[PDB]
């Protein structure tokens, strides 16, 4: 979950390579997208659209082993000065477009980095962020210019818990090498279902690979295939994804002056061509 | 890959607009 990133990685979600710590547990890789305007004027509310697409009619393995759907979650890193727009500065349609999202800053005094999720994966295939741009005029620590935006989005259950132990949403493997003999499910009424798989011979050996219930099985009886043999099949159907983009915190004066200059240029060009046209006449009156 | 499309279509397309325009001025003056 997005908060386990805070728990396990307090200072920042992004690693110096730009990998986003989210990947340390969500080991699958599904696409993710972040869309924002190419430019924004200072002190302006705008839309930042996260996209976390996946086959809607495709379910995953639940913690107990059932077949439940999947939720989406994401971390979004915006430039310094950017933050969620005050509820009062958000218009109606946008406010409606955003939904019941609970934008959560990564830590105290880091309102530009925002965690999101878990949200329902069917309704939030895309997640709208209502963002207010900063103002270099009132904040002298902010400047106009081009800045990066980093998305880290995810859908589906992770494979590793903060404690370290694995989960029931990934493949399991053998220990060493020896004859398997058992396929049972020594389930308690206190705990849930398991699956027994033994080992023997070659060098004594009497070890058992008791694994959780949830994945499939492609192993029947009596084998010994090294250590790392895929015997459980991969039940994962989600995955983490990153996308980066750029936004220009633009100054309108900067633009309008440019426009003026361009107009001047076009004027000058025109006059030069006209002059040439004037000369074309004078030259034509001296041919023969 | 949206800015790229705009850039491509326009950078490729507006050349013919400028061209045609130039020809239009040429026709207007009568060369």
């Amino acid at each position: 979950y997005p908060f386990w990133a805070q728990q396990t990685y307090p200072p920042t979600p992004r690693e110096p390579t730009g990998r986003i710590v989210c990947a340390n547990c969500h080991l699958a890789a599904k696409p993710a997208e972040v869309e924002v305007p190419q430019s924004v004027l200072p002190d302006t509310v705008f839309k930042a659209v996260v996209k976390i697409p996946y086959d809607t009619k495709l379910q995953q393995v639940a913690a107990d082993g059932s077949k439940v759907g999947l939720n989406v979650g994401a971390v979004l890193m915006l430039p310094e000065g950017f933050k969620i727009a005050p509820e009062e500065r958000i218009p109606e349609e946008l406010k409606k477009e955003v939904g019941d999202v609970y934008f959560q800053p990564y830590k105290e005094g880091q309102d530009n980095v925002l965690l999101v999720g878990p949200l329902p994966g069917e309704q939030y295939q895309e997640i709208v962020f209502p963002v207010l741009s900063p103002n270099p005029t009132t904040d002298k620590n902010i400047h106009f210019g081009k800045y990066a935006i980093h998305l880290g989005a995810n859908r589906g259950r992770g494979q590793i818990y903060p404690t370290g132990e694995k989960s029931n949403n990934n493949v399991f493997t053998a220990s060493a090498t020896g004859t398997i003999t058992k396929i049972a499910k020594e389930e308690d009424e206190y705990g849930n279902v398991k699956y027994q798989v033994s080992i023997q011979t070659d060098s004594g050996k009497t070890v058992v690979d008791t694994i959780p219930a949830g994945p499939e099985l492609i192993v029947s009886e009596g084998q010994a295939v090294k250590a790392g043999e895929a015997l459980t099949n991969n039940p994962n159907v989600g995955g983490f994804g990153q996308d980066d983009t750029e936004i220009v915190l633009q100054d309108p004066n900067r633009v309008k002056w440019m426009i003026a200059f361009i107009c001047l240029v076009m004027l000058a060009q025109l006059m030069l061509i006209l002059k040439k046209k004037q000369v074309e006449k004078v030259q034509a009156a001296e041919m023969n | 890959t949206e800015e790229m499309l705009y850039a491509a279509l326009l950078s490729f397309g507006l050349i013919f607009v400028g061209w045609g325009l130039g020809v239009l001025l040429l026709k207007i003056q009568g060369a």
Partner: peptide, 28 residues
């Protein structure tokens, strides 16, 4: 769509200025 309108008005404006100036200079 908006930018297209602006584009048309812009080029139309300067085109008009061109065709204007040429005749202004020619017939005088």
């Amino acid at each position: 769509i908006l930018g297209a309108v602006f584009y048309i008005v812009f080029i139309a404006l300067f085109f008009g200025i061109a065709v204007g100036i040429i005749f202004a200079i020619k017939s005088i």
